[PDB]
Amino acid sequence: PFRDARAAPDPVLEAGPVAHGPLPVPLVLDNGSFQVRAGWACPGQDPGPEPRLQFRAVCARGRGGARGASGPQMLRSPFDRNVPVNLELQELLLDYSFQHLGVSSQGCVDHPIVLTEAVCNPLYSRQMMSELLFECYGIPKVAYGIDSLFSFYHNKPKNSMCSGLIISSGYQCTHVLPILEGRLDAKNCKRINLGGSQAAGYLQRLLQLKYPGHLAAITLSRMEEILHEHSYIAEDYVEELHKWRCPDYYENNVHKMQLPFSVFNLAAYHQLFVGTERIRAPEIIFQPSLIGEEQAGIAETLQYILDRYPKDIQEMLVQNVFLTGGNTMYPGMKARMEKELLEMRPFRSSFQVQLASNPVLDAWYGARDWALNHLDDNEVWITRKEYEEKGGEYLKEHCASNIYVPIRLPKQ
């Protein structure tokens, strides 16, 4: 059967668990369209003791304005396509995180932060975000970096310059990030405009049209369970679905995902038999024409971005294919990726496919390790006063952050 999801934990804190040593201790903030997660950087502690505040990045407020259910409690989200594009909800989303993390005393957030952002971020979105973050929250210095390259930075052997493909896959996008001696090669980097949200929406739509007898009993928040728990990506899809064609293998693998009970009852309380549906939804990021989209998908994009390099520099980045983000939770994801890669590498040539030590939380642990290592750097952070002489589109180009384009934004 399904479970049901948690709500309303009590992660309340003091003015803040501010660590010893130098005065600043930064917040580590990860923003993505599935979940926000945030914690103090906890310097001098080798394992992060708690990536605090795991909660769904979706919020509600009363029709008289009287209360705001920002935490895990219909609802709305401040992102579009895994970039933040909001003010009036983005503030109450930040407020919830700071209020649970602890606020020191005065009319600003106390101490510096690393805030995770989209691969490329539209200049206006970083401007709107830095404007919120300096006008309302007043942070003394700020770092912007990428969830994917942070999770890579954690999974590195060392504080060393590296080359690789980051195969990222968040809630509403999956991106192939080629990197060259720590620099994200944003000139020829690519993304597929699909992810876990669209695979879960597809898995909902499949079971809606399979079971019109109870369109209300299935729901997106239950599809998120069977998509994480019981779905798997094929070793190769046209062969997996061929072994699903025979009733003996089908009956051995079709899942009794029962609805909660009050004819054999199943007309109202079905076992919701999922068979090829526990494959189809995972395959969306490899074959997005399953949801009708004409995008090249994660296998042909990896070929298309890779073959644009000189042959002698394709090797030392296929030497670190790095799988990361929420969809890489699927069992078999490494085993699929190394086949899709063997089918396109030169005949004898080596490749290496690494999976993030945690498929998703390593974005935050990466931003933590990054902030801990870069805490006392000057040139690496946007310092508060720089926002009076740079327009808020500005970026510092540290490792695990995007290219900066010398530019300005007109506004009134």
Binding site: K339, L342, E343, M344, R345, P346, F347, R348, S349
Partner: protein, 434 residues
């Protein structure tokens, strides 16, 4: 599985390391004096130095002459040409008698030619021609084991273009032969139309690039024939080749002179090595006096193979002499050119061993009480009749629901199928009704 045959049990001469015969070995029994003589002939053929030297296996019907000639073939194995012919094969209607001898003498001398068989196969990812016309063609190949690019010559590209190849076809290229085969469109394109008149093959589950050191076998007669007449020249892909049917033809001794002078030019380079072989002119008594008299050149010539003759005829007339009797049916002038090996009638115990070797080869379980009867019926008749009863007797035993021969099965078969000498008595009695 394989089919059992009249000789499928003989696997060698069965001689020991001294060159003397074992009583029963490598599927043969008895016959020691002739087997020891064949031991010397196997050493002669393995020694390569000799040309045209020849042997006659002489002796009664059903005494092992063809079994020993095939034992020589098995001692040498596939690595040295053994060419079997009946003397009756000489009567062609497209070429003269004394040509068919020379063709078969040239089949018994081999060339052994090593080459590194070098196969590429996979989905063609691209074809891109590169002089201003075509210097070379880059081709890309993919399989579920990886990818390669090849730099094809323009003649291989003409072959891709004759095979009607396009990007996404699954191709087999052989880099030695320049052979090209389209195998189908790669099935990743099987949705390109909902019906198209093509076969879609899955992307190969194998290497883009495969190597063997293959070791080719070819004979001077393959060279003589493939160089004498103008070749068919085109891979079908033509219709001039509809008009002129082939025939066998009297290949001139002047061409064979050049084929010899060319093969010397290649074996000096070590590109090929020679394997002097055996021609087995089985039942040589069926050659005509003109064929026999041509052997008085062919056995002298410094190129010729070793030749093994066989005969079972008495003091009979030489075929085509209309009058002249001579031993083994062979002219005395040729019989003075061959080393004769005698062949003998067996004792009953030596037949009984052959009956068991036949049974345990032919797949028959046989009880001793029936094997003693086939040993006796061999003495009443001939060795080949006894051996021929085994499968019929087993096949009645199988129909009678039994796992083995017993006396009643062979006894019933004896009274059901006659031998060549009991049947001759029926024809001598009923003489006026046949």
């Amino acid at each position: 599985t394989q089919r059992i045959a009249s000789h499928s049990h003989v696997k060698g001469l069965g001689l020991d390391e001294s060159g003397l015969a074992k009583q029963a070995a490598s599927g043969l029994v008895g016959q020691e004096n002739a087997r020891e003589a064949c031991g010397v002939i196997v050493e002669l053929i393995k020694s390569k130095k000799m040309a045209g030297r020849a042997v006659l296996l002489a002796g009664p019907p059903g005494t092992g002459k063809t079994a020993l000639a095939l034992a020589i073939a098995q001692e040498l194995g596939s690595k040295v040409p053994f060419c079997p012919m009946v003397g009756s094969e000489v009567y062609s209607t497209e070429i003269k008698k004394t040509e068919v001898l020379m063709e078969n003498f040239r089949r018994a001398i081999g060339l052994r030619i090593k080459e590194t068989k070098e196969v590429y196969e996979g989905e063609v990812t691209e074809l891109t021609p590169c002089g201003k016309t075509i210097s070379h063609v880059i081709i890309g190949l993919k399989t579920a084991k990886g990818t390669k690019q090849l730099k094809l010559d323009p003649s291989i590209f003409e072959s891709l273009q004759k095979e009607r190849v396009e990007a996404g076809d699954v191709i087999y290229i052989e880099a030695n032969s320049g052979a090209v085969k389209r195998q189908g469109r790669c099935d990743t394109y099987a949705t390109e139309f909902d019906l198209e008149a093509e076969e879609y093959v899955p992307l190969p589950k194998g290497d883009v690039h495969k190597k063997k050191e293959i070791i080719q076998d070819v004979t001077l007669h393959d060279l003589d024939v493939a160089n004498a007449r103008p070749q068919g020249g085109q891979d079908i892909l033509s219709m001039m080749g509809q008009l002129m049917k082939p025939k066998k033809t009297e290949i001139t001794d002047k061409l064979r002179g050049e084929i010899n002078k060319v093969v010397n030019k290649y074996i000096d380079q070590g590109i090929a090595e020679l394997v002097p072989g055996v021609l087995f002119v089985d039942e040589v008594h069926m050659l005509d006096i003109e064929c026999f008299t041509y052997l008085h050149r062919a056995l002298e010539s410094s190129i010729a193979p070793i030749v093994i003759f066989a005969s079972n005829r008495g003091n009979c007339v030489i075929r085509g002499t209309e009058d002249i009797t001579s031993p083994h049916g062979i002219p005395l002038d040729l019989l003075d050119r061959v080393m004769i090996i005698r062949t003998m009638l067996y004792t009953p115990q030596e037949m009984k061993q052959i009956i068991k070797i036949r049974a345990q080869t032919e797949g028959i379980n046989i009880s001793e009480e029936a094997l003693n009867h086939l040993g006796e019926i061999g003495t009443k008749t001939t060795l080949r009749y006894s051996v021929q009863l085994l499968t019929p007797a087993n096949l009645l035993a199988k129909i009678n629901g039994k796992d083995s021969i017993e006396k009643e099965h062979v006894e019933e078969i004896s009274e059901l199928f006659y031998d060549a000498k009991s049947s001759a008595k029926i024809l001598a009695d009923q003489q006026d009704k046949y």
